[PDB]
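dumping the sequnces here before i forget
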Amino acid sequence: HPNAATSDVNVTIDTFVAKLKRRQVQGSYAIALETLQLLMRFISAARWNHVNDLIEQIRDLGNSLEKAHPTAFSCGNVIRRILAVLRDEVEEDTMSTTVVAEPLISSMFNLLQKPKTDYRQVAIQGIKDLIDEIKNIDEGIQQIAIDLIHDHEILLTPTPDSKTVLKFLITARERSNRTFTVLVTEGFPNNTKNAHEFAKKLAQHNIETLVVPDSAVFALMSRVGKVIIGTKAVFVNGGTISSNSGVSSVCECAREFRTPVFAVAGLYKLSPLYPFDVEKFVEFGGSQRILPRMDPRKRLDTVNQITDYVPPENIDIYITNVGGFNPSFIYRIAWDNYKQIDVHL
Amino acid sequence: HPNAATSDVNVTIDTFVAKLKRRQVQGSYAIALETLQLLMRFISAARWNHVNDLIEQIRDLGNSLEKAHPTAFSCGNVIRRILAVLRDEVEEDTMSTTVVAEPLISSMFNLLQKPKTDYRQVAIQGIKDLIDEIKNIDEGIQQIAIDLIHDHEILLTPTPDSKTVLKFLITARERSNRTFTVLVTEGFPNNTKNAHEFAKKLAQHNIETLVVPDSAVFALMSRVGKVIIGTKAVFVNGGTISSNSGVSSVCECAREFRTPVFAVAGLYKLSPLYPFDVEKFVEFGGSQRILPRMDPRKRLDTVNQITDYVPPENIDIYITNVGGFNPSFIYRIAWDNYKQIDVHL
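..and the predicted 3d for all of it:
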């Protein structure tokens, strides 16, 4: 389905498309908020009267949105989240229009046994609940996370870019009973500016700050207590795409030294998609920021990448608003929020 | 050869044999001293005039001494040490009686190219030098060893029995610039009393003492900086026989956590023998110290062993009076002091 029907009534589709492609929109948290407001505008304005035609139209809109921007997983997840909230209430509604439906638990096995209302209002409130969930994640993290780190323990941190992780670290430093030393890898080609702001906010709160070059990670790994990841997107197998530069090597460095790896994330950040190849999912950077002068750049073919991937073999915990989960279990948390059909849009 | 010739002239042979079998003599350092004084009495008293008949007689005496006591490696090594000091001076003497002898270095390859004096005085002085070497090892250790351990690092120690290691630890604590926390595994069935005296002498010098049960080793390994071994005997492949109880598991615990392993030893403690099987070399303890009452001991077949073995896969450094060496090199240090023939006595 094209945007020919939604042009005069809905204009904000194309402005979000413009915000993605030229990267005017920044940070998964913000991308999610916009798509929420998009779906808010879609239900409030449209006229449908039919339900199945409506849902499949939403599926096509989400399909086009993910094709417009591949790194906007938070875009794709939010739509998929509302899709499933819709689908449950429709399946509840069809049971009343026809007239045991309660075997034991909420399982799977969709290959075995076969099969006017206020539905739109529920769809409205379903968006509102998603917003409030994205608004408050930190409260759900701090009750699980600030139980695992001890006094006189040194914390090494790749990806200082995450707003989520920094605020988790500040709530722990607020506790006068807890003392920890912070090592921060720079992440030269991208994270530098963000890493420097990270080091500034730690000094602002008076926490023992240590700025580390990306070479020196090995030269400290014997002294490191724990490793924390500021992830962007979490996957089925467990693995993460993080907010740029110098993570993968640090995780490899941690595993060889058998140093524990922590990850702080949200369920909206969590994705039901599978990373079959890193080659497709990871976004590459601009080599302009590395080396000046273009006549030597004929011979200097420089390689730089923004997003960094970690395989599930390294990290052990994904502390969310719900709780702490192991990478060998995180798939269930995903299927508790997104349906099996709501993947290939 | 029997002790029928050496009975009225030499009496102290049989008193040392009595000291070994009933374990009246204690600690490898003391066993070495006695055998030195034995060989001191053998040269001072005997009449030989011939050299090759003398050396082969000494070989038979050493063969009988090791058969009398298998755990007295320090006995076996000291004889082997003087044997080689003898053999070099004889080979130097035969070159003058006959009349390049200097190819490059001091090699091996005894399978390639073929072949009155003050010799007895040299044999006398050779014993004297061995004593002085055994008298002073600590001076040669402290100059290599107290260079590797840092401030705020936690040291876990199996085998508190060694006089060598404790004195190495006290010289480092003497340095006001160096601070370290000491964890000590108890070693229940044997080391207990010695471990408690170890903890007392650390408090006497005011070093942060921590007494650890043999179960709790795992529960601390994440926090451990380094591991130190108080070995009794070191071998060709690198591996060690240590002064009793709870070492092997600690070393296994260290390797899994990738925590560094240190060993403090002497060259007289070092052996040219190969441990083909632990089954033969390790001495077993007395089960009386575990469990009382003999009527249940019909059904309670309890297992306890004194000496503990460590494979070379774990430890990394053997700091001696000469210096620090890797287990993949220690064989050369051995061959620099003992000859190839002087093994199978």
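The domain at 137-336 of chain A is CATH 3.40.50.10470 (Rossmann fold).
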